[PDB]
Amino acid sequence: FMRFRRAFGEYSHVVAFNTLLFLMSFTVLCLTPVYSFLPGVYSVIYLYLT
Amino acid sequence: FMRFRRAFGEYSHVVAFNTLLFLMSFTVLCLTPVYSFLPGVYSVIYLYLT
């Protein structure tokens, strides 16, 4: 993490959350074909959390 | 110690105590098979010191 903070300057904070949200969304999309509940409830939770 | 402080940035302080506590716990676990008193009293002392 120190090495990561060495680069990317000030924008590392913006990059980290953007990567984490993308990874979470990718996992949710991967779990979609079996659990049909996710697309709505996860979107609602995401809207609440944003 | 100066060379160590050169790296790890701000988190060297967190790393040092974490390593020291792990080493102390490892020593206590190593002394366990003969001195059966240690698991309780050392845990109490650790809770007090934390």
The DSSP-derived string for B12-44 is HHHHHHHHHHHHHHHHHHHTTTT-TTHHHHHHH
CA distances in angstroms from A30 to A1, A39, A43, B7, listed in the order given: 28, 11, 15, 39
Q: Which residue has the tokens 């206590």?
A: B28
Residue A35's Cβ-side half-sphere holds a number of Cα atoms within 13 Å equal to 11
Question: A32 with A38: CB under 8 angstroms?
Answer: yes
Structure token pair of residue B48: 């007090």
Residue A3, min C-alpha distance to chain B (Å):
8
Residue A42, min C-alpha distance to chain B (Å):
35
Residue of A nearest to B9 (CA): A2
CA distances in angstroms from B22 to A42, B4, B15, B17, B37, listed in the order given: 39, 19, 11, 8, 20
Q: Is B7 left (phi over 0), alpha (psi -120 to 50) or beta?
A: beta
**Phi then psi dihedrals of residue B14, to 5 deg:** -65, -40
Resolution of the coordinates in A? 4.9
User: How was this structure obtained?
Assistant: cryo-EM
**Torsional sign, CA B30, B31, B32, B37:** negative
